[PDB]
Design a protein around this ligand. Structure first.
Ligand code: SF4
Ligand code: SF4
Ligand code: SF4
Ligand code: NI
Lengths: 708, 628
């Protein structure tokens, strides 16, 4: 049986299994029973991508078997083989969809099954910023548990997102691999069809970030081949179904690597028996590049350990919190004041503890020097300090400035981790991440209570005050140069951000100062200067140079952009906005929802459904994606009347932005704790009830001019 | 019917009609209905008791010649003599190359330009290379190659790419080759009156003779040419008659021997000759090549290709050819007569190829560069006799990419090799795409033009059909030049003509769907390639989904080529019927029984679309046999 016949045989078996499980759903639930995946806006993504049709009931699921049949043409030509691979992918999705119909919870821990849309958008940024070099789809079984654990942890230590299908899930558990979405080790399921759950991640990436409409299958296949850096490692004996599923991965442009003897196809299907070189073979086959990090600490330092969890039973000592106040500060000084590679520790070390999880004050004073180092770069360094400290195994860092929290686990301590290794990590990452400006870096870790008390008020508090003052002193009128971030163009070619003092990047990780620091550090980076000349309308937020820049960067996809409006040529979003705001014409205002919120909205749509209406780099009036810091902005919907249009917000988001929103709404002379007027899901969620609440509460939206 | 599918050819045919000169098409028309006996191969003239003609229809008319020879005997002897003549042409070419290799020196006109290739060849000839002078090695290699032509004791030397299974099959069949000239002499002896009167034995002798062409003569000629003049690599060129320049001296190199054309190319950069071209009122020197010598200089230097066999006369019809320099083979003698109607100097250079009423300037191999310089100076001085009012150069030229030697193909295949897997510098990626079925097979398109077929029509149709069916095509000779003129030798052609699997392969490897592997002797390269693939897969060459096609062949060399390709285990399609239809036993041997002997056989198909269909079906049959 040659390659073509193996793939055709596998697709027929996939079709046979899909027909059998659909018959069970019809007999048990009927053709009128609803068919859906948990928390998705694209129905069944593979069928929606291939045909544009949304499948909602069981009767339509049975009619989707004809899609599988039409994709299996048994002629030995490459196009038919790729179509047959897509037939297996469609059949696998139908099988997985029928699982949720038959069982309310078809997947138990540790398997996650289907991956919701908010999770995909959460990992959308890491993908664009390169935080995630690629996606390792590992399925099958390795010869032993340690071999699987070594390969999986090798991918994990390199920052790749690895997905597991089959017995490698159990082998990795025996190998003590830390699994989780935040640990970038996702077990999908023990059945081969569970590999469709990572396929739909790539498919929805084209739908979400690429802005490709459903039914444009070739554009979606082209997108996944160029944009999604996924590859398959198939271990253990491969059945015909596994090979046919691999042809589906090849159809999406994902190369398939295996330890089995197969009819190899160059750059697409490769055999690598040497398990010690499988990771390197896959990175070359998928053109994935990872920068090598060197750190003199006896612990594993990877980005995937940012989500590590340490139980209180096995915690060595904790700093910060309400136990003993701790602080962190990055300050710039003269060349002679800081000498390179001086990690001094003041006070007791971490090994002097002789008890249960101990309380000890902490202080991290970081002194960097350089010719191009100014006071404005300190916030960026201190912000990345949190990520630097959280990448160490056995170390969790929470908070910022003097409201920080550091915990060291016993696992890291038993490996020789001490307090000077904090300085080692900080020094290495400061000279590595910010080598353009940070010529020298002297880091001192303080555990003496008196020294921590006296240096916190002498060096840190005044700088916190000056940073807050500088942040409060920045408005769009004060500045004379905006910045444009095109980092997200790796997945949304038509999307260009314009970060202003009063409007940060919709991802929430790029601010005006962050953009200004990225431009200074990397003049060829995504952030570039955009002068605010050629003003057309200050109320709606229009500048001629901004339009010129957006046309140039987006290659003419977007010609006109307004920065302070939601209904006239709004700035595009891609997929990464923390919150999304949509107009509510019945309430004469706008509703808002964050990504973490997973309930309904007065518009009748969840966050995923709402967000599937304004992404991909397409100008969509009425729906705007933005960060949480843009909610309480004087330029938030300035053209449409400002903050008065906010009529419904989630309670968690309302509590997050209450103080800032009240302070900004005080300009409308609504001195009423304006956050109280806005409805929330704990008060009312349907349009009738929220409108009644607005009428009773005297909301400014009802008294304003019509928004549409 | 139309004379050609090429528009430049048609414009020049109109001009030739206006000028009152006759072409090969006109002479073909004048020949009218050709003799049926000779067309069927049932005419014999091997002794002066004849001429004898027997009926091409068994059971009717005269059955035997005067000596008693049957139609099958007459047909088999005629076929064998065609094979012997083709083998002689190729072997004489290779012999000249081997002698040139023997006369190489560090400070001479002929040097060694590819030392690595020479060392590999020396390994193949059991010549020591470590700690030795490169020219001592070259002379030893040339001695071994020359011994392949005329050794009377011992076994000949064959390339390592030839599978052991094929050698053993040849030995069991009785066709294992001897020295090349010895096999030619044996074939000529057995066709003498009153010798071999058994068709099966006659065909086997012809196969044995053709093997000395494919694996010894052509192979050694190609490899020694690579050693002396450089291994071809990917290179751009232009093709068709539009490459001629009105305002420059136009020197057209026609023939097969590469040493003369190499020396002419070198002489064209001589400062004195460039100054002389300027002084006669020309912008410069424009060298253009035709047929196989054009293929050689184009593969190695990017010299523009003016045209293939049936275009040679039309090159003169433009009125822009100042000098037409010819060595041997496929040089229409009518050129001499045609040259009287224009200013063109028609220069013969080889003692083997005197042509009446041409200007004879013997190419001196003792001083090749000076001899080439004086010949080129005659061509340049003829520019003063140009009549610009008679000049018409059609503005039809086409970009082409060529230079795909086996080494160049392996270098290209190295791109799609994962570094962590390997190995490098093998044909393994090609074997992988063939085994997986992404490529259905590989087909060699070779051969001449023939007035019996609309010129270049069969070549182009066969090539387009094959690449549309995900069959990668390698081309040589006049077929390669037809592909170049048409525009198939382009990377863009992959997305314009190829099927899905071949288009993907071309994109991944960055090659055209059609690979120009050189001249007619460079068909040995094809053998080499196939052999390597077979040796990588541990099978004989008859187990692979490969084929050869000669859509428009005319020459005895083409007959010998097809015979040794079939004998090597590669099915061959002939687009022009050979004169064998009069002998039913010979037809049955060539098209049916041959498969029992060597695992391949001839296919006679004059319809190119049907030929493509048959090739695809046969390749699928062999794939199903092989399990892929
Ligand atoms: S500023 Fe815009 S382009 Fe840059 S990361 Fe944020 S959303 Fe993406
Ligand atoms: S092939 Fe024979 S019979 Fe025919 S014309 Fe020639 S000599 Fe005469
Ligand atoms: S060899 Fe025989 S058949 Fe041929 S010409 Fe002589 S007598 Fe006739
Ligand atoms: Ni986005």
């Amino acid at each position: 049986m040659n390659l073509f016949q193996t793939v055709f045989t596998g697709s027929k078996q996939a079709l046979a299994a899909a027909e059998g499980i659909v018959k069970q759903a019809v007999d048990e639930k009927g053709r009128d029973y609803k068919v859906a995946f948990p928390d998705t806006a694209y129905s069944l993504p593979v069928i929606f991508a291939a045909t544009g049709k949304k499948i909602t009931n069981v009767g339509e699921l049975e009619g989707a078997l004809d899609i599988v049949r039409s994709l299996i043409v048994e002629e030995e030509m490459l196009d038919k083989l790729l179509n047959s691979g897509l037939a297996t992918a469609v059949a696998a999705e139908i099988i997985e969809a029928a699982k949720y119909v038959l069982s309310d919870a078809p997947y138990a821990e540790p398997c996650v099954g289907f991956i919701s849309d908010p999770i995909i958008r959460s990992l959308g940024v890491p993908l664009v910023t390169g935080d995630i070099p690629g996606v390792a789809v590992i399925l099958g079984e390795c010869p032993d548990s340690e071999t699987a654990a070594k390969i999986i942890k090798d991918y994990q230590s390199k920052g790749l997102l690895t997905c597991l299908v089959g017995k490698v899930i159990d082998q990795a558990i025996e190998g003590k691999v830390k699994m989780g979405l935040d640990l970038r080790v996702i077990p999908l399921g023990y059945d081969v069809t569970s590999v469709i759950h990572v396929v739909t991640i790539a498919i929805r990436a084209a739908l979400i970030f690429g802005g490709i409409k459903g039914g444009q299958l070739n554009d979606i296949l082209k997108y996944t081949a160029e944009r999604v850096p996924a590859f398959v490692n198939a271990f253990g004996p491969l059945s015909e179904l596994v090979v046919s599923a691999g042809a589906g991965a090849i159809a999406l442009g994902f190369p398939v690597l295996t330890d089995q003897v197969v009819p190899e196809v160059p750059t697409l299907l490769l055999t690598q028996k040497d398990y010690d070189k499988m990771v390197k073979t896959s990175l070359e086959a998928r053109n994935i590049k990872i920068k090598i990090t060197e750190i003199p600490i006896p612990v594993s330092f990877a980005a995937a350990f940012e989500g590590e969890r340490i139980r209180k039973n096995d915690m060595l000592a904790e700093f910060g919190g309400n136990k003993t106040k701790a602080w962190e500060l990055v300050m710039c000084a003269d060349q002679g004041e800081v000498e390179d590679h001086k990690i001094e520790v003041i006070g007791p070390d971490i090994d002097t503890i002789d008890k249960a999880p101990g309380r000890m004050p902490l202080g991290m004073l970081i002194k960097v020097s350089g010719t191009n180092m100014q006071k404005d770069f300190e916030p960026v360094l201190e912000r990345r300090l949190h990520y630097f400290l959280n990448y160490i195994e056995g170390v969790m860092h929470v908070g910022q400035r003097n409201l920080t929290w550091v915990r060291i686990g016993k696992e890291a301590f038993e490996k020789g981790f001490r307090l000077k290794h904090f300085g080692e990590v900080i020094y290495a990452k400061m000279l590595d991440e910010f080598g353009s400006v940070v010529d020298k870096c002297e880091v001192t870790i303080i555990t003496d209570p008196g020294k921590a008390e006296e240096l916190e008020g002498k060096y840190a508090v005044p700088r916190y005050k000056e940073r807050d003052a500088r942040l409060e002193s920045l408005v769009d009128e004060k500045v004379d140069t905006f910045y444009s971030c095109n980092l997200c163009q790796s997945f949304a070619p038509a999307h260009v951000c314009i970060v202003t003092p009063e409007r940060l990047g919709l991802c929430g990780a790029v601010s005006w100062l962050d953009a200004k620091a990225t431009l200074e550090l990397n003049p060829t980076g995504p952030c570039q200067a955009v002068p605010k000349e050629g003003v057309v309308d200050e109320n709606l937020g229009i500048w001629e140079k901004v339009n010129e820049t957006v046309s140039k960067i987006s290659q003419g996809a977007v010609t006109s952009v307004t920065l302070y409006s939601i209904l006239q040529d709004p700035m595009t979003s891609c997929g990464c906005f923390e919150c999304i705001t949509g107009i509510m014409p019945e309430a004469n205002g706008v509703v808002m929802v964050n990504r973490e919120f997973g309930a309904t909205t007065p518009l009748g749509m969840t966050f995923g459904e709402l967000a599937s209406m304004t992404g991909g780099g397409v100008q969509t009036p009425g729906f705007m994606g933005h960060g949480r810091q843009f909610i309480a902005s004087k330029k938030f919907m300035k053209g449409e009347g400002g903050l008065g249009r906010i009529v419904w917000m989630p309670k968690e988001l309302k509590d997050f932005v209450a103080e800032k929103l009240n302070k900004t709404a005080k300009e409308l002379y609504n001195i009423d704790n304006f956050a109280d007027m806005i409805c929330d899901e704990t008060i009312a969620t349907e349009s009738e009830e929220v409108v009644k609440f607005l009428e009773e509460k005297g909301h400014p939206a009802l008294k304003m001019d019509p928004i549409m | 019917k139309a004379k050609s599918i090429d528009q430049a050819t048609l414009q020049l045919l109109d001009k030739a009609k206006q000028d009152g000169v006759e072409t090969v098409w006109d002479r073909k028309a004048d020949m009218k209905v050709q003799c049926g006996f000779g067309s069927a191969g049932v005419c014999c003239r091997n002794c002066s008791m004849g001429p004898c003609r027997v009926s091409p229809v068994p059971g009717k008319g005269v059955e035997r010649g005067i000596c008693g020879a049957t139609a099958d005997v007459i047909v088999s002897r005629n076929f064998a003599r065609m094979v012997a003549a083709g083998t002689a042409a190729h072997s004489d070419h290779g012999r000249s190359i081997a002698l040139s290799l023997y006369h190489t020196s560090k400070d001479g006109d002929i040097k060694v330009k590819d030392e690595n290739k020479l060392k590999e060849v020396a390994k193949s000839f059991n010549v020591e290379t470590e700690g030795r002078d490169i020219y001592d090695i070259a002379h030893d290699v040339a001695k071994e190659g020359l011994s392949n032509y005329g050794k009377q004791l011992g076994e000949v030397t064959l390339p390592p790419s030839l599978p052991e299974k094929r050698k053993e099959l040849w030995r069991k069949l009785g066709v294992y080759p001897r020295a090349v000239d010895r096999e030619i002499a044996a074939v000529m002896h057995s066709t003498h009156i009153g010798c071999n009167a058994d068709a099966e034995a006659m065909i086997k002798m012809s196969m044995r003779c053709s093997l000395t062409d494919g694996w010894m003569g052509s192979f050694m000629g190609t490899e020694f040419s690579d050693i002396m003049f450089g291994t071809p690599h990917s290179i751009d060129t232009e093709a068709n008659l539009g490459v001629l320049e009105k305002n420059s001296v136009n020197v057209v190199l026609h023939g097969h021997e590469p040493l003369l054309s190499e020396m002419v190319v070198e002489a064209a950069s001589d400062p004195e000759l460039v100054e002389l071209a300027k002084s006669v009122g020309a912008d410069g020197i424009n060298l253009c090549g035709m047929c196989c010598t054009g293929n050689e200089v184009s593969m190695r230097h990017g010299i523009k290709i003016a045209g293939n066999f049936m275009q040679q006369e039309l090159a003169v019809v433009t009125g822009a050819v100042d000098g037409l320099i010819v060595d041997v083979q496929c040089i229409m003698p009518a050129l001499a007569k045609l040259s009287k109607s224009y200013h063109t100097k028609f220069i013969t250079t080889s003692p083997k190829a005197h042509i009446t009423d041409s200007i004879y300037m013997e190419f001196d191999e003792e001083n090749p560069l000076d001899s080439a310089k004086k010949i080129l100076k005659e061509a340049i001085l003829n520019f003063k006799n140009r009549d610009q009012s008679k000049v018409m150069i059609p503005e039809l030229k086409c970009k082409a990419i060529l230079g795909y030697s086996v080494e160049e193909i392996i270098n290209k295949l190295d791109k799609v090799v994962n570094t962590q897997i390997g190995p490098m510098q093998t044909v393994k990626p090609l074997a992988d795409v063939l085994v997986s079925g992404v490529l259905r097979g590989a087909a060699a398109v070779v051969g001449c033009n023939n007035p019996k077929v609309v010129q270049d029509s069969a070549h182009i149709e066969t090539i387009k059909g094959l690449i549309k069916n995900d069959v990668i095509v390698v081309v040589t000779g006049c077929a390669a030049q037809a592909a170049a003129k048409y525009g198939l030798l382009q990377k863009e052609a992959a997305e314009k003509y190829a099927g899905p699997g071949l288009a993907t392969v071309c994109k991944l490897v960055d090659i055209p769907p059609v690979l120009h592997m050189g001249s007619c002797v460079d068909i040995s390269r094809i053998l080499d390639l196939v052999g390597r693939v077979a040796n990588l897969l541990g099978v004989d060459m008859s187990d692979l989904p490969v084929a050869g096609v000669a859509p428009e062949w005319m020459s005895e060399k083409a007959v010998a080529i097809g015979t040794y390709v079939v004998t090597s285990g590669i099915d061959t399609w002939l687009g022009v019927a050979p004169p064998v239809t009069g002998g039913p036993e010979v037809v049955d041997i060539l098209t049916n029984k041959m498969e029992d002997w060597v695992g391949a056989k001839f296919f006679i198909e004059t319809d190119p679309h049907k030929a493509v269909e048959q090739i695809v079906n046969r390749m699928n049959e062999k794939r199903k046999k092989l399990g892929i």
